[PDB]
Paper text:
Phage portal proteins are key viral components located in a single pentameric vertex of the capsid and they act as initiators of capsid assembly. They are also critical components of the DNA-packaging complex and are involved in tail assembly. Here we report a number of crystal and high-resolution cryo-electron microscopy (cryo-EM) structures of the T7 bacteriophage portal ([name]). The structures show two conformations—open and closed—of the portal and suggest a possible mechanism of the channel valve that regulates DNA passage.
We solved the structure of the fiber-less tail (1.5 MDa) by cryo-EM at 3.3 Å resolution ([name]-[name]-[name]). This complex shows a tubular conical shape 293 Å long and 175 Å wide, organized in two 12-fold rings ([name] and [name]) and a 6-fold nozzle ([name]). The channel valve of the portal was found in its open conformation, which should allow the free passage of DNA into the ejection channel. There is also movement of the clip (5 Å), caused by the interaction with the [name] adaptor in the assembled tail. The [name] adaptor protein is assembled to the portal clip region, forming a 12-fold conical ring. As the monomers are inclined in different directions in [name] and [name], a single [name] monomer interacts with four [name] monomers, as also described for bacteriophage P2212. The [name] nozzle protein forms a hexamer attached to the bottom of the adaptor protein. In particular, the tail nozzle ([name]) shows an unexpected fold with six β-propellers, which are essential to tightly close the channel gate in the mature phage. In the mature virus, the [name] nozzle protein is the main molecule responsible for closing and securing the DNA inside the tail. This task is mediated by four closing gates with negatively charged residues found along the [name]-internal channel.
Residue numbers in the entry:
A (entry chain A), F (entry chain L): 294 to 342
B (entry chain e), I (entry chain d): 2 to 50
C (entry chain O), G (entry chain M): 7 to 196
D (entry chain d): 547 to 735, 745 to 794
E (entry chain N), H (entry chain X): 6 to 196
Write the structure that this text describes.
């Protein structure tokens, strides 16, 4: 329950432009640059449950 | 594809042979020149009165 | 034309790719390298303002014909002209504008056009100045100093400059899908 | 400097030279011996540009101070001009005396430090050996009979070296467009003549670097070869 | 034409350190033929890398005032990219002066509020952008005067490393959180 | 039931920046760098059960 | 500057890749190889402390302006400075730190900054000493002694050194996800 | 400057055995130009391979004591990396002395408990690490003085083999079990 | 790309020809030297008084 947006420094998209844009505002960037940090315990979660 | 030459010794002298005949360094007309061996190609000595 | 303090820096940066700086370019029959790069520079200017950008397309502009001649004059300054809404009815013919639907030439009143006017190397943003300098450097590379590796790096670096300048245009003039256009402005009226 | 050479002849391998100062007129002997010793004594054939074998007289040593007073118009014929004077002893003792500001006519003395009652003292000038290598560039042999050197392109040097054989200490000065470098080279760490390869860096365009070798310090010098190591990218081709 | 700076000399000296020997105290167009040329390349990359827009260079709410008698406000080459504050930026240079392409006029009564980007020196920048500006100018100097494949490939890889670090500096300078910082999904999370 | 976050040293992302960021804070990094240590006994777990 | 007992070993290990050991480096107009490698060493130092590590980032530091001039001084020692929480408002302008929201330069009281201060080749962990030596050796390889295979092995070995030094940073100052940060500390309070 | 060790001479003799001839009793900086040079490369790798942190080298609960009159405790180049005992290690060197970046002070009243790594010789190491230190210094000597592709490729493969063996030594020295030896899931399995 | 030469016989002597004219080994000024064949380039014999 902690959203961290990881922006890929090697790319183009940058968060002075995602955030300031109103809704439905075009802005420049590629989608493979921003991702979000998941917590990949799945097999541990199923065995614990 | 990007050829370079270096005509390195302009001792030369005029030669009224055609273009695809000549040596390097020669020239097609040379007036008031002086082609020494070590120093290249000088203005001629200045005719003291 | 006239010397421009930024334009001589541009023609110098064209020759920064190959060789030595010239000075001031103000002679017709002159240094062939300077006038040659200056022709390449103005051609890339005329092409780079051709594509249509949001600071260039002067939207609702009105042209007026001559009072005696009754004829509004197309120019080489008028880079590309289109009509306002759709199915643009204006074309150049002789050096004069012309209707391909009214089948006529003489205009009584004015005319409303989306036109592009040719601007200098000045009066452009620095993004576009760097893009004209790098694309004209690629052209000047390919046409006179034919070396392969500098062409590869100028191709990569033109791509980076166009990347930056599309970032400028999608940042100059924020375009929003659902609150700014002509179709889905009304669909979201409650 | 300021020394006129007014004759030169050579019996079999000895070049007898008279040479004129601005005060006197000398006579000399340039011997082309290889490892032999010029004067009786002299542990390493000191390169000295004038070379006496002097015995220090009785009264020169002041008991109060530490030095002896050797008088150069007496150890030679008469006065000198200007130059650097080296005093050598039968040990490895080498004392270098700089010139006075007026120069060896206002101060004709030579202040050798120690007690010198009588002991063989070899006094001379110093050679000014200077040699530049060339402007370093590509020199490839053009098929048995001509040396055509390669001009097209930029050759960025990295290093160079001087092959020396049984030699002393020397100083490879390297000049640039607007820079200077010294690059000394000590002994083999007494005399300690070495037989190795001193490797000094020269960095630049090779059209503007100019390396030149000095040596003053009384020891022999045998530069038997050199060589460099550059970069040389060429934005053209041949044909 | 400019006066020297204590760090700009080390910058141009690190440009010539790609291929060449270190100069000192440039001060002329004839001190070295390669030094002043690399200084021109360094000032060009200085003008370019601040055109991309960064969160410390975009001076957000700036206000320009026109001349009192001339009734006219001066665009400059020192001005680097100027946009409007909210959206559909209406300001563009013509002649040497800023101009409204919607009002269709160049006579301003009061001031003008602009997201401007100004040109700064090689100094007054963070060390991240100094290192990246030296590496990109070094690649440009290499490709234009001693074009060699090995040094070009390694300066390309090392430019990508510098841009990676400087995007890290931008994403660290001015933390941009999605849900409590922007304009749209700040109001959606008001309870 | 022991979460260990393995950060890949070969990558870019680093945990002085995941942790200090508040929720929904952009921060720099790639998602393939952080993973989490699972315990991959699955066939042993099914045969034991 | 001054001779340092470990920095001479660093300049020697730069030249361990190519050639011979110099001695003591204490002259401006000197051995060009030693001073040139020393410049590469200090550049890789100033870059390797730029990336931000959790021993260099002095967190809550307070800077004070001059009492007469009323003007707190940015320095080249102040490597990269940011504010404490978020949306940092301090930037260098003239050589002096400057608010870009308060639009002012003169400060009455002090200022709270996360700052990086430039340190020497000493005052660093041995991990980072080995990493500055190997990366500056790669730079010194690529710019003067252009041999390909030593460039390949120094690239591989730079990657291994950075691997070790990231291991040092994630072992210096254990960062746990759920009991040490600011957001999900409060979510696990029972 | 150091004095010889009977095993260190065999180590340096195994460095020169990659390319070159065997020396005996080094004793000088002018005995061989390659012997002292490889000895310097060997001491550099001796410093480096203990930086990585091993289970026999991280001396866990060590206690440094400051000087009595100086009221100050001395960081050394002999100290290789020092960290705090539990977490968020607050110790770093400034000037030559250890220093708190949280307490913001350089004056210690009592002692200080540190996970320190001290520098050791080529001797006082296990034979696994001696062999890996000789093979890595052999690769470093090869790539800097007789760079040839065949001997480089085989020393790279054989360095990876030595690192394989020495990680086997580290996972064997100091047995680490997941569920009965650590800090978190020792308590979870208390019945 | 990393060129090396070895000017091996500095017998030479000065030559005031230009740079792209010379042989190897020559030099641009040589004072008090002595260029023997086998032994390379010595300081001259020292002028016994």
């Amino acid at each position: 329950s902690k959203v961290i947006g990881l922006v890929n420094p090697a790319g183009i998209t940058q968060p002075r432009r995602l955030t300031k844009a109103q809704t439905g505002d075009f802005v420049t960037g590629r989608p493979e640059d921003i991702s979000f940090l998941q917590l990949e315990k799945q097999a541990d979660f199923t065995v614990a449950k | 594809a990007l050829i370079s030459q270096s005509i390195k010794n302009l001792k030369g002298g005029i030669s009224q042979q055609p273009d695809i005949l000549r040596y390097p360094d020669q020239g097609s007309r040379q007036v008031n020149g002086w082609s020494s061996e070590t120093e290249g190609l000088q203005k001629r000595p200045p005719l003291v009165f | 034309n006239v010397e421009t303090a930024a334009e001589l820096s541009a023609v110098n940066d064209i020759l920064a790719s190959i060789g030595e700086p010239p000075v001031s370019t103000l002679e017709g029959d002159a240094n062939a390298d300077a006038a040659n790069a200056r022709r390449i520079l103005n051609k890339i200017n005329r092409q780079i303002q051709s594509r249509g950008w949001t600071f260039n397309i002067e939207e609702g502009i009105t042209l007026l014909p001559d009072v005696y001649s009754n004829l509004i004059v197309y120019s080489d300054d008028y880079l590309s002209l289109m009509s306002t809404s759709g199915q643009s009815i204006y074309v150049n013919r002789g050096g004069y504008v012309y209707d391909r639907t009214s089948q006529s030439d003489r205009f009584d009143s004015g005319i409303t056009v989306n036109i592009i006017r040719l601007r200098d190397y000045d009066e452009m943003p620095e993004c576009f100045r760097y893009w004209i300098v790098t694309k004209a450097s690629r052209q000047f590379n390919n046409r006179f100093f034919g070396a392969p590796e500098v062409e590869g790096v100028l191709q990569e670096e033109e791509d980076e400059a166009r990347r930056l300048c599309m970032e400028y245009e999608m940042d100059y003039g924020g375009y929003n899908m659902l609150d700014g256009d002509a179709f889905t402005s009304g669909l979201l009226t409650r | 400097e300021n020394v006129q050479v007014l004759a030169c002849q050579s019996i079999s391998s000895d070049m007898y030279v008279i040479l004129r100062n601005e005060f006197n007129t000398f006579l000399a002997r340039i011997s082309f011996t290889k490892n032999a010793i010029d004067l009786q004594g002299e542990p390493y054939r000191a390169f000295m540009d004038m070379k006496i074998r002097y015995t220090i007289p009785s009264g020169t040593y002041n008991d109060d101070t530490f030095t002896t007073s050797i008088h150069i118009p007496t150890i030679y014929g008469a006065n000198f001009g200007r130059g650097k004077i080296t005093v050598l002893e039968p040990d490895g003792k080498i004392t270098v005396f700089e010139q006075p500001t007026a120069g060896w006519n206002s101060d004709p003395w030579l202040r050798l430090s120690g007690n010198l009652e009588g002991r063989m003292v070899y006094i001379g000038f110093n050679i000014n050996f200077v040699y530049e290598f060339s402007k370093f560039l590509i020199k490839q042999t053009a098929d048995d009979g001509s040396t055509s050197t390669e001009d097209i392109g930029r050759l960025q040097l990295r290093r160079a070296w001087v092959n020396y054989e049984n030699s002393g200490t020397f100083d490879i000065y390297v000049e640039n467009q607007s820079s200077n470098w010294k690059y000394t080279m000590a002994g083999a760490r007494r005399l300690n003549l070495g037989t190795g390869q001193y490797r000094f860096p020269v960095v630049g365009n090779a059209k503007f670097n100019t390396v030149y070798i000095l040596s003053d310090e009384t020891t022999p010098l045998n530069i038997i070869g050199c060589g460099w190591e550059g970069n040389y990218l060429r934005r053209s081709s041949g044909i």
